[PDB]
Design a protein around this ligand. Sequence first.
Ligand SMILES: COCCn1cc(-c2ccnc3c(NCc4ccc(OC(C)C)cc4)cccc23)cn1
Ligand SMILES: COCCn1cc(-c2ccnc3c(NCc4ccc(OC(C)C)cc4)cccc23)cn1
Lengths: 38, 38, 289, 289, 238, 247, 247, 50, 49
Amino acid sequence: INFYKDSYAASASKQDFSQDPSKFTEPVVEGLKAAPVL
Amino acid sequence: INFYKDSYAASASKQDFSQDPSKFTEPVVEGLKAAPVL
Amino acid sequence: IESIIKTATDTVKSEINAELGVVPSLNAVETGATSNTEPEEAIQTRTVINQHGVSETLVENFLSRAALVSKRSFEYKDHTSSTADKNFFKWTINTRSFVQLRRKLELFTYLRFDAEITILTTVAVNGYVGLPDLTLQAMFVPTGALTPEKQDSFHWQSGSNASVFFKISDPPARITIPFMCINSAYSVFYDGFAGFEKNGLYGINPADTIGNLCVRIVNEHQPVGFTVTVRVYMKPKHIKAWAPRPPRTLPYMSIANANYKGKERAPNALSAIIGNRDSVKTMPHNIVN
Amino acid sequence: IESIIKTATDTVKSEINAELGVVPSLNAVETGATSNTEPEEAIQTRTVINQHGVSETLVENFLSRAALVSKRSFEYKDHTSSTADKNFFKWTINTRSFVQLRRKLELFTYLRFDAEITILTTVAVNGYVGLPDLTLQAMFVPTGALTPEKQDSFHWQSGSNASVFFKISDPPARITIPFMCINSAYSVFYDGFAGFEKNGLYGINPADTIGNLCVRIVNEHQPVGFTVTVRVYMKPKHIKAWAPRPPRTLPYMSIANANYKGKERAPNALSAIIGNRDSVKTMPHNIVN
Amino acid sequence: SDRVLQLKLGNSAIVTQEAANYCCAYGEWPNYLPDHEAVAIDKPTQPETATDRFYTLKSVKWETGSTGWWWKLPDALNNIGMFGQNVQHHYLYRSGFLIHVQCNATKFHQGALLVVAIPEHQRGAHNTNTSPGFDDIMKGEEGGTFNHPYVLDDGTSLACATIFPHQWINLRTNNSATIVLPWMNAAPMDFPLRHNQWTLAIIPVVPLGTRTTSSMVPITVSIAPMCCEFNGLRHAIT
Amino acid sequence: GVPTYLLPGSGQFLTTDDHSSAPALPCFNPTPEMHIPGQVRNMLEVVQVESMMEINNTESAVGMERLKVDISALTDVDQLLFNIPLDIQLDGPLRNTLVGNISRYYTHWSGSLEMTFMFCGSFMAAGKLILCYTPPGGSCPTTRETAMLGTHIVWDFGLQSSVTLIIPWISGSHYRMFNNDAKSTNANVGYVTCFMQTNLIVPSESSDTCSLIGFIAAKDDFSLRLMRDSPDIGQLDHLHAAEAAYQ
Amino acid sequence: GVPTYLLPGSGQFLTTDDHSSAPALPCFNPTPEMHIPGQVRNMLEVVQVESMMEINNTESAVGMERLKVDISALTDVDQLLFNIPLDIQLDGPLRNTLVGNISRYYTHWSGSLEMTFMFCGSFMAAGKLILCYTPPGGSCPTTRETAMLGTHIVWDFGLQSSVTLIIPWISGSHYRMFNNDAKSTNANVGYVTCFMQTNLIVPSESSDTCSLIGFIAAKDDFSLRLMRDSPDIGQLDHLHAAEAAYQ
Amino acid sequence: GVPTYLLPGSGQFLTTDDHSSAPALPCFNPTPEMHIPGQVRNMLEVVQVE
Amino acid sequence: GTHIVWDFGLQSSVTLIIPWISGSHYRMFNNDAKSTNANVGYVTCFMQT
Ligand SMILES: COCCn1cc(-c2ccnc3c(NCc4ccc(OC(C)C)cc4)cccc23)cn1
Ligand SMILES: COCCn1cc(-c2ccnc3c(NCc4ccc(OC(C)C)cc4)cccc23)cn1
């Protein structure tokens, strides 16, 4: 329920389930094998 | 009337009329006759 | 076999029997089955079309009634000299302190439910000036979070704890708490020990720990003292229930255990649950004319 | 690669390995990548279908909880002889004064959010007569607008400032403030100086300046003094967050900087964050039976 | 017909010629944990016939003053055979049980035993505020005796105990009772040394009596774990 | 805005109300459901399970002795053995039963009852009993040729250990009340009486005295109405350690 | 108008509520969004990043010295090198870690952990270690032939510097608790122990003593539940210059 | 939320008002209806009797 | 070990199978009864009740 004119008034947005942890866990230029890694 | 985002907020669910009393009244492996029962 | 039952069963008319080899009134209790004798088999019956509903004994309806779970009174005053709940209290959340709710819940072995919480506040002047319209804060402190130590400690800033602020002049404060067990159901009874050593608590499943309820008055103290009483009501809802149990017969002794003593004499004595009659042939309320 | 994750991952059953040239438990930490060893590669596993949701660690849910940002008490009285907040106060808006909210926000480098503000008011009689149902005015004074100098100054006429008027007997006053940075995100940390000369403030991005909150009692003073406490709560919402950070370990010293001292001894001492054990071979809570 | 029964599990078999059907608790049968209910991600060991076999406990004497007897599961089996060894080396266990209770007498004897499997039989103490201690609860293979069978030692009642899975041995009618127990827990698996899912209770609601020459009338309990699984292999607690 | 007005009952706390209310923990995910044996969905499933009657509620019956009735060989014909008070509201053999305990959370009831008796003598013991239900209106019958005029079953002891007497729902009203006035026409059910039809006959090496266990359950025509606080439980004080939850 | 009534909970301030509220600045246009590196959307992405364990949490380890474990050549076989307490709630090597710090805002947890060890001796240093996880129930093993019975990896030092021990989620319940009672069956995870499998062997011109750095992260089967105030931070007083915001 | 304002007559108890109100006994099943002789539906039926 | 629990009843008789449990295809009828090529193990009877 949102009868206010400005959209920033709305209730919280708990629906964004997109993740990309590899930008923190694997920021290497060459992706690693699941051969030895070096 | 439920305008809350979480479904556990809803009012009570008084609509489940399924019963199976035989799981307490007749938990025998062989169902009994309506011959003598032993 | 599962079926949908909205009303009590109809009765069919029945005739005289006299069939050899058929004995529907004989049973074998040793099997553990309950008697399957129908009324039509025991007597000659008429036809009755039965319209009585069964909705009031639904487990949802039986349990989803708001009941008192906690009641605390404390002095709202300047506490500088007191030794006491100093404008706030902490409560370790449990369902075992008030026997009417406890006995109904203990009809089952496992329960899954969300908890509707209603918080009712009342105030009286200490031994009159009128009653103040105070603001209260209730804060839920989960396991391993720190409880407040003072009325004004920084724990009350509630950065991640859920708090509700409510006035005395408001309608009672209300919130729902989800089913929060780490298992799929609460263990209403627990034949086990809470810890990996031998000295842990018997009878309390660690999986069922809710946490602490912390309630303060937010106003600074007035020049005069008041007594404030907080009552907490729980209503289970969205209920599933498993494995029905023998009801409690002896008075409860403790919130911590099932210990029992009985009443000093029947009814509900340890030696005699039902009150005595003079003999097995005595009819106690026999009609005589 | 971005993907939509609603639940924790399933485990597949695994067999015995013994493959030459394949060493999934060996890794190279020097690359800066985290270990990619899967459980199925380290041990023989069963199949588990995993139904645990991940919604409670969403950044929106983690941060969008209302937390105390400001708390001010002032005397509501005739102030003609006082030297003091004379029925009003001014607050320079910041997120750094209460550590529980501060530490959660400081897990990130950049944040974009709208701020839901709840204003809770409480009153006590000075050392009793009953509590007055006062009207308050909160006025937002942006950068370069003039702040009020008195309880009754003409700045309170609020021709273009946003004001909210609220009673003590009301529910807490609530408003939303939009994301108002002159950049696309707030700088939670700022490795820079605010001015073009060398003497400007280190560590505060000028781009993030919100302004001042001015709160007065609107009633004229009564014949008796009261203490009024105003509590302001902020809830971030519609949150985007960038570049996660090492959490704060040492106690905060100042709202103005990251300065640190540590506790006098572990835990959270400057020389020892974790409390000591007797040796690297000592198990502190070892089960013994 | 259904007075004779044979039970075969592993290398063990039991025959009775005087059964009274048998009970499947709540109409369930034991099963292994399916993938859509599993929690622990390691591959379970499933020893099958090494564990899923009848173990016979020490017999108890039925005497005119007896209050009745109880055993807790898995506690009573945690030190027996390969079931005990798997229990001692694994953090987590799960199983059903097959319970077979044996008591025979002459056609001149009378007496009735209630044989009831109680889930989560959390015991109370009598006439004290102090909760039962570890040695009051964890009796192992020997089991315990009821203090106040009339209230099931839990302040409830014997009279309503028929709400639980049960049979009777009525000496006139039958000489054995059989109850099949599914896994009965709020979690899918449990630590076997700190929680008991089931208590077997045997209570003499009608006392043993006769006017023949007296003999020792024993009650014997045989229990087969069913569909045993173990997770979290480590050194034996033992 | 919407023009509105408040009704009577605004702001009340009714303990049986049914509304949605604010979730205190947003985005909380409850533990996945798991199948558990023995789900109950209606309390009527519980009262259909038979449970022992405390028929021997006499002084000099202690504990378990109260759940059985002892029968002996008699030397006079047609003798009365026992009677069962049928008032579920007043304290008696039916109160501490599954049907009894659940029904006492309700005020109104309807439908038939079954009593089952198990004979627990020796195999060599023989006998016939008559079990009679008398509809209400008069005194409980004390002689067999009076009790015989009501609803009854004649029970022969044999290989089948147990007999059922149905107590049929015979009532002018749709419901009866659990009324403390047991003589009220809205409450009184009548009586169950047991007589010798023949005799208990046993050889010398059997025990001369044999026991019955009585059981009661509701049939599936049974209904309960108007929920109330059960008078079975109460507290006069705080329980032990209830104060310690505040410390 | 519409007839209405107020429910319990009317007018309350619940800090986790979720409603729209009045915009104080009408027609305000927020700054256009700009792409920024490193957006996080779930806190589970952070706990999957490995971070150093404070394994050497001993007196006479100061600061950075607490983040490494020193290994020396031994003259006895099979010797214990170190153990790691696995209780995340109680203070120990795991607390000040990314997985540790984020998890302490929650009460319930599930799923597997990975420990990675990096050997930082010289190139000429050789050795084999055994890393063991013991599921809970007994004492922490003090001998290699006991620890060897649990989950383990045997690590050979080589060109790949680092080894992972997976700690698999082995639990009876769906979740564990971050419980201050570390011996609770709902909380205790068991133990990690490190033994010599062979020995540390080095030539004369290498340093005779070599270090391990231990790291921990969660795997992607990991879940957190029931948000709470983290016990890691607190204040006893106003911060410096917090009063000056009112002046 | 919805912006609202209270009218005159808000909170009054008018004895002839006609609103729904909160059921105190949820899921109560009233006794089945039975035909009874002599139902009256309008009081004008009574005043037509001499 | 391998066992049967025998209840006396209308059927007079019970069978215990001794299953062929051996490492080798055959055993020997060896006068050295303790030889691993010969020893079969034991049958024992106990009271169950
Ligand atoms: C058969 O029963 C065994 C299982 N079992 C369930 C519960 C239970 C669960 C959740 N809650 C409870 C409560 N709720 C108090 C409350 C909590 C948080 C609040 O939050 C506000 C401060 C924002 C308010 C009030 C009071 C009493 C009991 C409970 C206890 N045992
Ligand atoms: C990680 O954080 C770094 C970025 N950051 C965001 C904020 C912030 C933004 C907007 N507002 C805030 C507020 N709001 C007080 C308020 C303002 C106007 C009001 O208007 C009424 C008088 C009509 C009412 C209350 C209190 C505290 C903080 C804020 C501060 N720093």
